[PDB]
Amino acid sequence: MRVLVTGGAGFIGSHIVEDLLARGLEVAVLDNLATGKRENVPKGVPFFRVDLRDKEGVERAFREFRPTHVSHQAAQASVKVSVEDPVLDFEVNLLGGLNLLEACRQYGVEKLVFASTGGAIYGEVPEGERAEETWPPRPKSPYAASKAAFEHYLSVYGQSYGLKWVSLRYGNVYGPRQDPHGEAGVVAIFAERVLKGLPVTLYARKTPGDEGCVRDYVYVGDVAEAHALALFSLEGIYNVGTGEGHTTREVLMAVAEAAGKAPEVQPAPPRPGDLERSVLSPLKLMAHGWRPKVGFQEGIRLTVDHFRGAV
Amino acid sequence: MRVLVTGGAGFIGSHIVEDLLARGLEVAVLDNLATGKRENVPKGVPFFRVDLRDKEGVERAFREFRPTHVSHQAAQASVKVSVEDPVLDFEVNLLGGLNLLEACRQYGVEKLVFASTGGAIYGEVPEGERAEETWPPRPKSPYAASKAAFEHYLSVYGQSYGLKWVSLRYGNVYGPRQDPHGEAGVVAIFAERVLKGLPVTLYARKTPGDEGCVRDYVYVGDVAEAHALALFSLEGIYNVGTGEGHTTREVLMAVAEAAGKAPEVQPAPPRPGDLERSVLSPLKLMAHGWRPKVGFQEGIRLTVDHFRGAV
């Protein structure tokens, strides 16, 4: 078993790499360092600094590492950026994604584990409900469209070429090592700024000044666990979430509590591309024994502690 | 109103162009002639020999014609070809489509009418049932994945940038000027071969020697009618089919009757990637008064007549 992790120098990817390493598996990382850092990839790990949009570079990486499994975490991970620059989101997630797929069938890769977005692919999730995998994709932003589109390709690549796959629809992932630049990266932005007495911006879900949007927050540690489970024995679509929603205001207050400092809030109108509410049902995955071993309050404390000592 | 129709030199596109012209509309065509013909575009209609994959080219066409509405019929129309060349299918349908959408946004186009595929997005349609617009996409080939993905982009461009859209899920479109490669290419194949007295290959549905696969055959003239209705007053997803299925054997028998010759049959076992049965529900479009004015038997005669004169 040889696992190639694209975007392995990123937030979630780095946690996947360390997890795989702890399981004694052979791992490699492919990353163009657009948002990730080389420091995130441990010394005893082959690193391929190539862009997925560069066909020649992807082919050389596969040729040198000969992966049996591919964990695809590389992507333009930002709803806002996708709304402002749809072509850039398309090029990396679709175009870059297709290059990866072509390399997989060409090198006979066994399985591909994909990082999809459970938080945005389902569209608005009504009050009191939780999105299930049987729900149809109803993207609102180009980012969600590129992810839904890629799921379709791996589905036809499975049917047409026998490629085994799994699509992990993550909720809002947070935890140590994430950068303060993302829609879900609100936990990192809040933790880093609040600890430093810096004013934070709270985007409304409807009116500047309200509680903000609701999301399903999952600790990155539990996501890495779901990923290992998927890699070894799952096939198909699986939500990776907690099943409980939190408003952005609750996130800030939780972070403020752990940080030990009063927050400075600047209200802002809702930003384009954002859904008002997203909560996922984790039932299908929990049937395989998986469970978020880290609760929200505990997760925030672990993230704040990371930033409090992070340099 | 200025209507630009991509793929206007092809089968369905040419019938759409004539229809819009007969309604006294100002029409333009953009086609790279990959499989289209320059003669299908009538004199007086500005023609832009551009490939959708060429941003500079599409940009130029929009600058000169300044369309208010766009009908997107250009694409890699072969399911079999997408299976053997997914990259080509992706580049033209998604990369090309995306360039088009960006052009629509940049030049403030009002509405985009898309040619989607009913037969391949819904997947296998159970016996006695007819696929409804509310059924989720279950693509099997790269081509179907390409079409389903573009529908997602249309929806997000609608929600994010205000672009009005309509997705027409055509059934098996047949009629004069068609080639033997499209989803209903079997009609052109039988017509040409029966007239020439050449053996006809009849692929089995499940067991060899059966009636063959079931499809919802709609005369191109009727899809042109629906297209005009949608362009002027519809938004959202609409199936464009008769809601009646026909086996390959009856298609051959209808062609034989119209050709007035006993066809030579070359049986063949069922081929993979072929859907057993597809029938669309036309209820949603029918609620707006639309109805096919050309029955199957009549439609096949009109098609066979076209091929008789095809020197």
Ligand SMILES: NC(=O)c1ccc[n+]([C@@H]2O[C@H](COP(=O)([O-])OP(=O)(O)OC[C@H]3O[C@@H](n4cnc5c(N)ncnc54)[C@H](O)[C@@H]3O)[C@@H](O)[C@H]2O)c1
């Ligand atoms: N973090 C969340 O809350 C969340 C939730 C659901 C889905 N997602 C999705 O999961 C993945 C992101 O993980 P993260 O939280 O570590 O985010 P991140 O943005 O911190 O990291 C992304 C990583 O991928 C790399 N990358 C980007 N484009 C590349 C390209 N062209 N070629 C090669 N590498 C490239 C970056 O350099 C970086 O290391 C993406 O696929 C994203 O769309 C994120």
Ligand SMILES: NC(=O)c1ccc[n+]([C@@H]2O[C@H](COP(=O)([O-])OP(=O)(O)OC[C@H]3O[C@@H](n4cnc5c(N)ncnc54)[C@H](O)[C@@H]3O)[C@@H](O)[C@H]2O)c1
């Ligand atoms: N007719 C059917 O059975 C059927 C059914 C459902 C959907 N479709 C879809 O509907 C549409 C219309 O097809 P048709 O029946 O006229 O078939 P066709 O193959 O005869 O015509 C397609 C036309 O588009 C052009 N084209 C291809 N790539 C291009 C590019 N990159 N840039 C510009 N022009 C390009 C071709 O030159 C041609 O004129 C297609 O988009 C197809 O995917 C076909």
